[PDB]
């Protein structure tokens, strides 16, 4: 098996829908965010709700339940937290993880940039390569669901390689033609 990481900004929506999805196909998947903190929407001309990474989903859920039950089920934030609660304890910041993967998948250019940066800014004498891949996906629950499909179809095609390091470039092309998408690709070193 190959260790797959999915990264977005808040580790709340896009990455978790891909986390949930990869896992349910029996994949070795973890998920993070790249933000400073976990920012959640609240009435579009307001200051958003903010929580330090490491905060239980369940508590955030509660913090939102008390604040306005009706408003936050309305925008499906209560359900989305309900769903995350069941996967892992809390949201995790990517630049604080010590785990290692074969493929880190990012869901938008900004996050793709942050991850690549922070990994260049590190270094160590494993010299074991990790492939960072970008697959754009729009930050809404419907578009995230569909993003998990695409993402899980990409991984499913790479978990067939027994020499991923030399096959990947070609499998990204094959895949970009088939899905009519652009997949950015860096190779960083652990």
3-state secondary structure of 147: helix
Residues 29 and 22: beta-carbon distance below 8 Å: yes
Enumerate the domain spans of the chain. 1-35+92-190, 36-91
3-state secondary structure of 86: coil
Neighbours of 1 (CB within 10 A): 8
Q: How was this structure determined?
A: X-ray
Burial of 190 (0-12, 13-18, 19+ CB in 10 A): middle
Distance, in Å, from the CA atom of 80 to the CA atom of 13, rounded to the nearest integer, reads 7
- Write the CATH number of the domain with boundaries 36-91: 6.10.140.550
- Please name the residues in contact with 37: beta carbons below 8 A apart, sequence gap of 6 or more: 50, 51, 52, 53
Q: Which whole-number Å values give the CA distances from 88 to 12, 56, 105, 133, 152, in the listed order?
A: 11, 9, 19, 23, 19
Query: 132 has which bridge partners?
Result: 104, 186
- CA-based angle 42:73:136, to the nearest 5? 65
Q: Do domains 1-35+92-190 and 36-91 have the same CATH topology?
A: no
Maximal CA-CA distance, the chain: 52
Paired sense of beta strands 103-106 and 3-8, if any: parallel
Distance, in Å, from the CA atom of 187 to the CA atom of 131, rounded to the nearest integer, reads 5
Tokens of 182: 């652009």
How many CA atoms lie less than 13 Å away from 149 in the CB half-sphere? 7
User: 1-35+92-190 adopts what CATH topology?
Assistant: Rossmann fold (3.40.50)
- Helix spans in 50-95 (H): 57-74, 77-85
Tell the residue number behind the tokens 């990790």, with chain if given: 130
Neighbours of 45 (CB within 10 A): 5
Strands (E), the chain: 3-8, 28-33, 38-40, 49-51, 103-106, 129-134, 184-189
Residues 174 and 46: beta-carbon distance below 8 Å: no
Alpha carbon of residue 39 to chain centroid = 15
Residues 165 and 149: beta-carbon distance below 8 Å: no
Sign of the C-alpha dihedral computed for residues 163, 24, 133 and 178 taken in this order: positive
Distance, in Å, from the CA atom of 170 to the CA atom of 158, rounded to the nearest integer, reads 10
Q: What is the DSSP letter of 47?
A: P
Question: Resolution for this model in angstroms, one decimal place?
Answer: 2.9
């Amino acid at each position: 098996k190959l260790a797959v990481a999915v990264v977005c900004s808040s580790n709340m929506n896009r990455s978790m829908e891909a986390h949930n999805f990869l896992a349910k196909k029996g994949f070795n998947v973890r998920s993070y965010g790249t933000g400073e903190r976990v920012k959640l929407p609240g009435m579009a001309f307001d200051k958003p709700n903010v929580y330090e990474f490491g905060t239980k989903y369940e508590d955030i859920y509660r913090d939102l339940e008390s604040k306005d039950k009706e408003f936050y089920t309305q925008n499906g934030l209560l359900h989305m937290l309900d769903r995350n609660r069941r996967i892992k304890k809390c949201p995790e910041r990517f630049q604080d993880t010590k785990e290692q993967f074969d493929i880190i998948v990012t869901v938008e250019e900004r996050v793709y940039d942050l991850v690549v940066m922070h990994m260049e800014s590190m270094e160590s004498v494993d010299n074991r390569p990790v492939h960072v891949l970008n697959v754009d996906v729009v930050d809404n629950a419907e578009d995230a669901l569909m993003g998990a499909f695409v993402i899980t179809d990409m991984i499913n095609m790479m978990a067939k390689s027994t020499d991923l390091d030399n096959d990947i470039d070609e499998l990204i092309q094959e895949f970009e033609e088939r899905r009519k998408r652009v997949i950015l690709h860096s190779v960083l070193f652990y």
